[PDB]
Amino acid sequence: IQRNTLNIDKLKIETAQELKNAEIALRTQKTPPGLQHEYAAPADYFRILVQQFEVQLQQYRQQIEELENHLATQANNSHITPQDLSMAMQKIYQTFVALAAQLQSIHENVKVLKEQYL
Amino acid sequence: AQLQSIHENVKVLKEQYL
Amino acid sequence: DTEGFGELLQQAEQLAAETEGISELPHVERNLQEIQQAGERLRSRTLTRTSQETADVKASVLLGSRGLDISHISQRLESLSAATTFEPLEPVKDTD
Amino acid sequence: RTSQETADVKASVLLGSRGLDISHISQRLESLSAATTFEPLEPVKDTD
Amino acid sequence: ENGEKITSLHREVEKVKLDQKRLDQELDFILSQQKELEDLLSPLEELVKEQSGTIYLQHADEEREKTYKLAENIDAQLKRMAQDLKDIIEHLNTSGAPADTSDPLQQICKILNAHMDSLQWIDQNSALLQRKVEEV
Amino acid sequence: GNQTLTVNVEGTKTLPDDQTEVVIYVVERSPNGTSRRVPATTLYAHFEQANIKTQLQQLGVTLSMTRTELSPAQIKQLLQNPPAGVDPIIWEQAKVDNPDSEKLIPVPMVGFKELLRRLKVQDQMTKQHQTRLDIISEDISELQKNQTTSVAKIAQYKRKLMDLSHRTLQVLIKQEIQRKSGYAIQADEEQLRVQLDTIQGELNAPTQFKGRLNELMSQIRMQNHFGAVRSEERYYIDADLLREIKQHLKQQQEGLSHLISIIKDDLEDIKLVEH
């Protein structure tokens, strides 16, 4: 049900932006042609749409390049050893301790700002 | 620093045995 | 007792699915050598921000405020990584 | 038994769990070993 | 003990029986917004079909239809390539898994993935929170 | 038969040896039109009158009581004396052995006929716990089904937004061609085309996206045709080695849960400084 929550309020933002796009088409048609040159918003929409294509193409590139990591190792990872399991737990735990130590190095700063401002 | 190097080992025995 | 990892996995998938700022695409279920590499590829970004000279102490202040001891979990993970478990080399498949 | 490479750090875990900072106590004990404190005494015990 | 455990569990149940009853209302509110979007678009779609009877008269009209139709082609390729990528990832995740998931090792390796991306979220959001501590 | 009174049944509950527990309350309506409950001790002080109790027994009542709160005064006065034939040492010790001092009170057990009376109530209470777990299974069968109905709604409504987004795009494309019809190509529009030409180049380049995606959909099949032609190395990891691996992964996961608290806690707190 929580995996539904975050999909629903995402789709609510997705749908509210498409209503806001279609209002540009609704406004451009109601604008008289002797003033339609003053309404930049269709060119703002196409510039934003191209910038959204340019962002999606970088995200699609990363997932291809991480799939090309995954298959290059899964072609060689011939079984699973208890020592790969040991070394996975050990590496993740040191990454966890290091990130808890980073979060301490921020969470105390948040309090120094809070006890200055409220 | 010596007692830290023992007091922790006591907890390793304790959560192994109880 | 007979209460296996699937109960803890169901909570692991929750901690992921309540941090996922939902993508347009699904995520990839890595094999264990990309898991080992993702750990170290991330730790090598953490340890340019935090010196290891203070790491375990700062983590114990933060997580000890919630009742976790780190040194016990480390010494468990040292004894678990010393444990001489099962002997490998699986026999030949099905038929030949 | 204990390497000095970890001493002040391990002591700060153990005694910091009980509310002690070792770094302020060391920096006090540094100033208490740098400080040019008094020589002969101003007049206490005035019935002498 | 069972009496207080069951008297807890039915509260937990009725809270989730309210959570879903928010989600059904928010979903069919989105359905209302998508119906309004369509009754806002459909009059524009027909008036723009009438105005598609306009004759182009310069090479600058010809290249201009090609420019904005290139965006229409790219949109219809990217909103495909998302499904072409998704089917690769869901066919990979549903074939990297051995045929018995009651196994401890599959359960541990999937816990270790969810811990690894809990940590990749902790890194990225620590690298956001610390910037707001550099802004204030 | 008083016209200012309404009798209400709040619950009925099966008991052992062919009896039923019935919970009732009375409502009084005043001559100005307001209503109240009638207090339990006041209603019991009607029922315990011999002229009323005889009529309740003629309706088949075996026992009558309140279910009223005991003040600390009433509790302390009850505990102050050992019950008939209980030893004082056992009666004082049973106040220390009492595991919840504000929900629970010590009550004697005398002869096997009291033990059997408890065991029959435990049998009937076990059934009344089961009849609630049966309904909690139907409640969770509403939830997992309606959860799946929400997934089906999302999987339709995202695909309906795709129809409407393509329709907004095809309207705006034609409106912009129509708005600039008869004008020369503009600087905004040559920049837009040079970005779109570059993007269309990246999408058609034989070593970019489509080429890679078609060799990935080759590789996964070549691998999986031979993966199903290995043996399964079925490692016998020990049961208590797996117990401590579960406990390590638990303390690591409850630790991650506190970090994922703190980053959300702090990221909402900082928004209270920015406003």
PDB file of C-alpha atoms in Angstrom, chain E residues 5-136:
ATOM      1  CA  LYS E   5      -1.675  -8.795  20.871  1.00  0.00           C
ATOM      2  CA  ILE E   6      -5.038  -9.252  18.989  1.00  0.00           C
ATOM      3  CA  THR E   7      -6.321  -5.905  20.406  1.00  0.00           C
ATOM      4  CA  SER E   8      -3.167  -4.326  18.863  1.00  0.00           C
ATOM      5  CA  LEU E   9      -3.397  -6.226  15.519  1.00  0.00           C
ATOM      6  CA  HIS E  10      -6.995  -5.062  14.806  1.00  0.00           C
ATOM      7  CA  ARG E  11      -5.928  -1.352  15.322  1.00  0.00           C
ATOM      8  CA  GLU E  12      -2.978  -1.922  12.936  1.00  0.00           C
ATOM      9  CA  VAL E  13      -5.433  -3.514  10.412  1.00  0.00           C
ATOM     10  CA  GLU E  14      -7.994  -0.641  10.589  1.00  0.00           C
ATOM     11  CA  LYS E  15      -5.217   1.998  10.124  1.00  0.00           C
ATOM     12  CA  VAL E  16      -4.201   0.274   6.823  1.00  0.00           C
ATOM     13  CA  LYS E  17      -7.970  -0.037   5.980  1.00  0.00           C
ATOM     14  CA  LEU E  18      -7.961   3.826   6.158  1.00  0.00           C
ATOM     15  CA  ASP E  19      -4.616   4.232   4.222  1.00  0.00           C
ATOM     16  CA  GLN E  20      -5.995   2.286   1.178  1.00  0.00           C
ATOM     17  CA  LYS E  21      -9.240   4.374   1.403  1.00  0.00           C
ATOM     18  CA  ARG E  22      -7.143   7.573   0.946  1.00  0.00           C
ATOM     19  CA  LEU E  23      -5.381   5.936  -2.055  1.00  0.00           C
ATOM     20  CA  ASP E  24      -8.648   4.948  -3.859  1.00  0.00           C
ATOM     21  CA  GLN E  25      -9.871   8.601  -3.476  1.00  0.00           C
ATOM     22  CA  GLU E  26      -6.546  10.122  -4.702  1.00  0.00           C
ATOM     23  CA  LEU E  27      -6.524   7.643  -7.655  1.00  0.00           C
ATOM     24  CA  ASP E  28     -10.078   8.512  -8.792  1.00  0.00           C
ATOM     25  CA  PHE E  29      -9.273  12.233  -8.252  1.00  0.00           C
ATOM     26  CA  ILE E  30      -6.359  11.691 -10.755  1.00  0.00           C
ATOM     27  CA  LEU E  31      -8.923   9.951 -13.059  1.00  0.00           C
ATOM     28  CA  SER E  32     -11.049  13.160 -12.772  1.00  0.00           C
ATOM     29  CA  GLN E  33      -7.987  15.352 -13.649  1.00  0.00           C
ATOM     30  CA  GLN E  34      -7.206  13.100 -16.683  1.00  0.00           C
ATOM     31  CA  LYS E  35     -10.898  13.373 -17.782  1.00  0.00           C
ATOM     32  CA  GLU E  36     -10.738  17.207 -17.493  1.00  0.00           C
ATOM     33  CA  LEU E  37      -7.390  17.257 -19.396  1.00  0.00           C
ATOM     34  CA  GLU E  38      -9.114  15.242 -22.185  1.00  0.00           C
ATOM     35  CA  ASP E  39     -12.229  17.522 -22.412  1.00  0.00           C
ATOM     36  CA  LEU E  40      -9.777  20.496 -22.469  1.00  0.00           C
ATOM     37  CA  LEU E  41      -7.652  18.837 -25.262  1.00  0.00           C
ATOM     38  CA  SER E  42     -10.452  17.394 -27.501  1.00  0.00           C
ATOM     39  CA  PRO E  43     -11.813  20.871 -28.615  1.00  0.00           C
ATOM     40  CA  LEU E  44      -8.203  21.961 -29.414  1.00  0.00           C
ATOM     41  CA  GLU E  45      -7.553  18.700 -31.363  1.00  0.00           C
ATOM     42  CA  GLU E  46     -10.600  19.296 -33.666  1.00  0.00           C
ATOM     43  CA  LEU E  47     -10.013  23.075 -34.208  1.00  0.00           C
ATOM     44  CA  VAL E  48      -6.316  22.270 -35.013  1.00  0.00           C
ATOM     45  CA  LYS E  49      -7.506  19.610 -37.571  1.00  0.00           C
ATOM     46  CA  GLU E  50      -9.563  22.366 -39.334  1.00  0.00           C
ATOM     47  CA  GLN E  51      -6.490  24.692 -39.186  1.00  0.00           C
ATOM     48  CA  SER E  52      -4.411  21.819 -40.738  1.00  0.00           C
ATOM     49  CA  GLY E  53      -6.122  22.948 -44.024  1.00  0.00           C
ATOM     50  CA  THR E  54      -3.586  25.868 -44.177  1.00  0.00           C
ATOM     51  CA  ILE E  55      -1.238  25.835 -47.231  1.00  0.00           C
ATOM     52  CA  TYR E  56       2.521  26.159 -46.484  1.00  0.00           C
ATOM     53  CA  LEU E  57       4.229  28.727 -48.803  1.00  0.00           C
ATOM     54  CA  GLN E  58       7.988  28.878 -47.893  1.00  0.00           C
ATOM     55  CA  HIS E  59      10.930  26.512 -47.234  1.00  0.00           C
ATOM     56  CA  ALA E  60      10.854  28.044 -43.693  1.00  0.00           C
ATOM     57  CA  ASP E  61       7.388  26.387 -43.205  1.00  0.00           C
ATOM     58  CA  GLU E  62       8.732  23.037 -44.589  1.00  0.00           C
ATOM     59  CA  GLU E  63      11.834  22.916 -42.318  1.00  0.00           C
ATOM     60  CA  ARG E  64       9.700  24.152 -39.354  1.00  0.00           C
ATOM     61  CA  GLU E  65       7.255  21.206 -39.606  1.00  0.00           C
ATOM     62  CA  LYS E  66      10.361  18.909 -39.788  1.00  0.00           C
ATOM     63  CA  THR E  67      11.867  20.584 -36.623  1.00  0.00           C
ATOM     64  CA  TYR E  68       8.748  20.152 -34.439  1.00  0.00           C
ATOM     65  CA  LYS E  69       8.045  16.641 -35.932  1.00  0.00           C
ATOM     66  CA  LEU E  70      11.601  15.625 -34.883  1.00  0.00           C
ATOM     67  CA  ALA E  71      10.525  16.233 -31.238  1.00  0.00           C
ATOM     68  CA  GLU E  72       7.374  14.088 -31.949  1.00  0.00           C
ATOM     69  CA  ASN E  73       9.669  11.292 -33.255  1.00  0.00           C
ATOM     70  CA  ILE E  74      12.105  11.556 -30.281  1.00  0.00           C
ATOM     71  CA  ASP E  75       9.167  11.477 -27.764  1.00  0.00           C
ATOM     72  CA  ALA E  76       7.812   8.306 -29.505  1.00  0.00           C
ATOM     73  CA  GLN E  77      11.358   6.757 -29.331  1.00  0.00           C
ATOM     74  CA  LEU E  78      12.225   7.701 -25.666  1.00  0.00           C
ATOM     75  CA  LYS E  79       8.737   6.689 -24.320  1.00  0.00           C
ATOM     76  CA  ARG E  80       9.418   3.372 -26.145  1.00  0.00           C
ATOM     77  CA  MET E  81      13.067   2.949 -25.026  1.00  0.00           C
ATOM     78  CA  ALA E  82      11.840   3.161 -21.398  1.00  0.00           C
ATOM     79  CA  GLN E  83       9.725  -0.034 -21.985  1.00  0.00           C
ATOM     80  CA  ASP E  84      12.601  -1.597 -24.054  1.00  0.00           C
ATOM     81  CA  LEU E  85      14.911  -1.004 -20.978  1.00  0.00           C
ATOM     82  CA  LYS E  86      12.258  -2.058 -18.385  1.00  0.00           C
ATOM     83  CA  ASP E  87      11.688  -5.417 -20.152  1.00  0.00           C
ATOM     84  CA  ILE E  88      15.509  -6.056 -20.129  1.00  0.00           C
ATOM     85  CA  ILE E  89      15.684  -5.324 -16.352  1.00  0.00           C
ATOM     86  CA  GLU E  90      12.560  -7.359 -15.365  1.00  0.00           C
ATOM     87  CA  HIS E  91      13.681 -10.307 -17.618  1.00  0.00           C
ATOM     88  CA  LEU E  92      17.158 -10.098 -15.933  1.00  0.00           C
ATOM     89  CA  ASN E  93      15.826  -9.925 -12.311  1.00  0.00           C
ATOM     90  CA  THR E  94      13.352 -12.821 -13.091  1.00  0.00           C
ATOM     91  CA  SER E  95      16.167 -15.041 -14.561  1.00  0.00           C
ATOM     92  CA  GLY E  96      19.079 -14.302 -12.126  1.00  0.00           C
ATOM     93  CA  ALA E  97      16.967 -16.026  -9.375  1.00  0.00           C
ATOM     94  CA  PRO E  98      17.191 -19.872  -8.836  1.00  0.00           C
ATOM     95  CA  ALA E  99      13.935 -21.885  -8.754  1.00  0.00           C
ATOM     96  CA  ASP E 100      13.692 -22.237  -4.905  1.00  0.00           C
ATOM     97  CA  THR E 101      13.287 -18.882  -3.071  1.00  0.00           C
ATOM     98  CA  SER E 102      12.839 -20.597   0.353  1.00  0.00           C
ATOM     99  CA  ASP E 103      16.696 -20.682   0.230  1.00  0.00           C
ATOM    100  CA  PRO E 104      18.626 -18.609   2.872  1.00  0.00           C
ATOM    101  CA  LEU E 105      21.331 -17.608   0.281  1.00  0.00           C
ATOM    102  CA  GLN E 106      18.867 -15.956  -2.179  1.00  0.00           C
ATOM    103  CA  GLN E 107      17.208 -14.241   0.838  1.00  0.00           C
ATOM    104  CA  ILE E 108      20.609 -12.965   2.201  1.00  0.00           C
ATOM    105  CA  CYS E 109      21.821 -11.743  -1.257  1.00  0.00           C
ATOM    106  CA  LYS E 110      18.508  -9.802  -1.758  1.00  0.00           C
ATOM    107  CA  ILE E 111      18.829  -8.323   1.810  1.00  0.00           C
ATOM    108  CA  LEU E 112      22.435  -7.261   0.899  1.00  0.00           C
ATOM    109  CA  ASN E 113      21.152  -5.495  -2.290  1.00  0.00           C
ATOM    110  CA  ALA E 114      18.453  -3.608  -0.289  1.00  0.00           C
ATOM    111  CA  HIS E 115      21.140  -2.635   2.315  1.00  0.00           C
ATOM    112  CA  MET E 116      23.483  -1.470  -0.507  1.00  0.00           C
ATOM    113  CA  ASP E 117      20.794   0.886  -1.957  1.00  0.00           C
ATOM    114  CA  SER E 118      19.734   2.027   1.531  1.00  0.00           C
ATOM    115  CA  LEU E 119      23.448   3.082   1.715  1.00  0.00           C
ATOM    116  CA  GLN E 120      23.470   4.655  -1.814  1.00  0.00           C
ATOM    117  CA  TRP E 121      20.416   6.710  -0.671  1.00  0.00           C
ATOM    118  CA  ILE E 122      22.192   7.633   2.647  1.00  0.00           C
ATOM    119  CA  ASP E 123      25.294   8.838   0.641  1.00  0.00           C
ATOM    120  CA  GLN E 124      23.251  10.938  -1.850  1.00  0.00           C
ATOM    121  CA  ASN E 125      20.939  12.504   0.800  1.00  0.00           C
ATOM    122  CA  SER E 126      23.884  13.174   3.195  1.00  0.00           C
ATOM    123  CA  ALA E 127      25.365  14.890   0.072  1.00  0.00           C
ATOM    124  CA  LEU E 128      22.109  16.993  -0.054  1.00  0.00           C
ATOM    125  CA  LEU E 129      21.624  17.753   3.700  1.00  0.00           C
ATOM    126  CA  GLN E 130      25.299  18.859   4.020  1.00  0.00           C
ATOM    127  CA  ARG E 131      24.755  21.321   1.091  1.00  0.00           C
ATOM    128  CA  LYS E 132      21.824  22.910   2.990  1.00  0.00           C
ATOM    129  CA  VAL E 133      24.300  23.139   5.946  1.00  0.00           C
ATOM    130  CA  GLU E 134      26.537  25.048   3.381  1.00  0.00           C
ATOM    131  CA  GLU E 135      23.607  27.409   2.341  1.00  0.00           C
ATOM    132  CA  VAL E 136      22.271  28.711   5.767  1.00  0.00           C
TER     133      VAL E 136
END
